[PDB]
Amino acid sequence: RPKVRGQAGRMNYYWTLLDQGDTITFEATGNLIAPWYAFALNKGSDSGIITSDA
Amino acid sequence: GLFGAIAGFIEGGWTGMIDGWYGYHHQNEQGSGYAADQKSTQNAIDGITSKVNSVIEKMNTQFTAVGKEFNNLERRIENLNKKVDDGFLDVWTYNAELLVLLENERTLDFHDSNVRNLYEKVKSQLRNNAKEIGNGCFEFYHKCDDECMESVKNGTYDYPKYSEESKLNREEID
């Protein structure tokens, strides 16, 4: 496949929300990009994203 | 519809009158006039205040509304989203403009009705001794001072006090 930013490989990114309690297991034999930090989320609704230059 | 008073049988307004919307102008033995009618103008202020507050409180405020994002294989849903936003915007702008346009004729006719009723009251409590002359003026065959002026204003005229004496002067002019 053609080069982008001088690289011919590609990489895919994934995400998952755990719950409280429940576990998760990674199991790999060739290509893992392991997580190294993660995030614990609060609540409080009605936010968003704004594109502005003010 | 148009009740016929404002810019009708009564000519233009009075700049010299300040403290109200509807009032009188009297010329007895010792002065000129421009006194307001605090009874009717208070009812007009109450009606208009309630009207504006009602129009404000029918419209709910909106909460957070932020745009969404779609990739190149979700064109169909993206067009649906745009259709929903444009439809609701058209409906609300229609409602706003139409509400203001109808409310304006309602309020102007309301003022016109108030002026006509305020004229009819004064005519009705001066049945014989007045001789109305044009654009809402009267002319007292008998003699009047400040007390009978206030007596007209409040709505307590007691016509049979003067009913004979006026009659004499009327038969003088006829």
Ligand SMILES: *[C@@H]1O[C@H](CO)[C@@H](O[C@@H]2O[C@H](CO)[C@@H](O[C@@H]3O[C@H](CO)[C@@H](O)[C@H](O)[C@@H]3O)[C@H](O)[C@H]2NC(C)=O)[C@H](O)[C@H]1NC(C)=O
């Ligand atoms: C509407 O107007 C009438 C006037 O026709 C008001 O009644 C009047 O009240 C005034 C108060 O200043 C009276 O004037 C004074 O009364 C005192 C007390 O008797 C007297 O000592 C003074 O010499 C002077 O007369 C006025 O006489 C009285 N009306 C009469 C019969 O002349 C009335 O209060 C006003 N309000 C309403 C809603 O009627």
